[PDB]
C-alpha cells in the first residue's frame with residue numbers, strides 16, 4: 062500500500078494492508094489473507110455462520126467504470142458513475158437485469174468484476190456467493206451475497222483480485238486467465254462451425270423449411286446443424302414436438318443421415334405454467350410464500366424455475382439430456398439459464414448459485430465429454446468449467462437497430478458491442494459466442510458493409526462462427542463474407558481501447574490463419590478498416 066489510493070482502501074471493514082486476519086462478528090466469522098500476486102493483490106479465505114450480504118472491499122468510486130451484467134444478454138460497458146440514475150426494472154424480467162434487484166433499482170451495480178483506466182477489481186469465482194460491486198454514495202463497495210444461507214462449517218470465500226497496470230486490456234486478460242485456472246475452464250482446441258434456425262425463422266420454423274436448409278447446408282462449411290426454439294410443444298416439454306415436426310429422435314437421425322452434428326435448443330431450467338411437466342410436478346419449482354414464483358414472463362406465459370436443489374429435478378434433467386445424447390445430439394444450446402439462479406425458496410437451504418451449479422453440472426454429466434455445451438441467457442462466472450461456448454451478448458438481429466436503445470432488445474449493434482467489451486473471456490473462460498452471422502441478401506435490412514463489419518469483427522476476435530439464414534437467400538456476397546471470416550480465426554485478440562465511450566474500437570489479433578491482423582471498427586458510423594499480414 063505505498064499507493065495513496067491503496068492506503069485509502071478497506072478490506073472486510075479494516076484498513077487495507079498485507080497479512081492474515083480474522084473478523085469475528087455477531088452472526089458470522091471470516092478468516093482471510095491479503096497477499097501480493099503478479100500485478101496486484103489477492104484476497105482469499107473462508108467464512109462460516111450467516112454472512113448475508115458480506116462487505117469485502119471499499120474504495121472511492123472512479124468517475125468512469127466498465128461495468129458488467131451477470132448474464133449473457135446484459136451490457137458490458139463504460140458508464141459515468143456519478144451521473145448514474147437507476148433503471149426501472151420490468152417486472153416480467155427482473156432477474157435478468159440483476160440477481161439482487163434491490164441494488165439495481167437504487168445504485169450502479171457491476172457483477173463479478175469492475176474496471177477503471179489502469180485497475181481491475183474482480184472475483185475469481187461464483188460457486189456459493191454472488192459477487193458484485195455497487196457504487197453507494199460515491200464509494201465502490203464489493204460484496205459477496207449469500208442469500209441468507211447459513212454455514213455450520215467454513216466454506217471458501219470467492220477470491221478477489223485487485224490488479225493495477227496502465228494496460229487495462231492486459232489486466233482484464235490476466236484477470237480472466239486467473240478465473241480460468243480457479244474454475245478449470247473448458248477451452249476446446251476445436252471450434253465448431255454451424256447453422257442455427259433462429260435468426261431467420263424465429264418461432265415460425267417448420268420441418269419442411271428445415272429440410273430445405275438441411276439440403277442446402279451441404280454447400281456451406283457447417284459442422285453443426287442446430288434447431289432452435291420452435292419444435293417443442295411447450296417450455297419444459299422438450300421431448301414432445303408440435304406442428305409438422307417429427308419426434309425429437311427422428312430429427313436427430315435425419316440431421317445425422319445428412320452428415321451434420323445434430324444440435325438442439327432447450328431452456329432447461331424453465332417450465333411454463335401450461336407445460337405438462339409443471340402440471341404433473343408443481344412442487345418442482347422455486348417458490349415464494351410456498352407457491353410457484355414466476356421467474357420471468359415470455360412466450361405470453363408465466364415461466365417458473367426448476368428447483369435444482371431437488372434430486373427428482375436433477376434426475377429428470379439427467380434423463381432428459383441422457384436421452385438427447387442417445388438420440389445423436391452432440392451440440393446443446395442451453396438457454397434462459399438465469400432462471401435456475403433466481404432467488405427464492407428451494408427444498409434445500411442453499412444459495413441460488415449453488416443450485417444453479419448443480420443443474421449445469423448434471424447436464425454436463427448427462428451429455429458427456431464429447432458433446433458441446435453452448436450457454437445462453439446465463440450467469441457467466443458460475444458456468445466457467447462447465448460450458449464449452451457462451452453467448453456473451455444480447456441477441457443480434459437482421460437489422461442494425463438504429464432506434465434500439467442499449468436495453469437488451471435485439472439489435473446487431475448492441476450484440477457486437479458486447480462481443481468487443483467481453484473479448485477477454487474468449488479462450489480463457491470458454492469459447493465466446495458473439496451470436497449468429499446473418500449473411501442473407503433478402504429478408505433483412507442489413508447492408509453489405511454492416512454484415513462485413515459484424516462478421517469480420519467476430520473473426521478477428523476468434524469467436525464462434527455460426528450462420529443463421531434461409532440459405533436459399535445467401536448469395537455470392539454472403540458466401541464471400543463467411544469464407545473471409547473463417548480466415549481471420551485462430552488468433553489472440555486484444556481490444557486496445559476497451560474503455561472507449563464513443564463506440565470506436567481498435568482490435569488486434571496475433572497469429573490468425575491470415576497472420577497478424579488489425580481491425581478498427583466504428584459502431585456509430587458502421588465502418589471498419591481491416592489490415593492483414
Ligand SMILES: [Mg+2]
Pocket residue numbers: 488523551552
Ligand atoms: Mg482460439
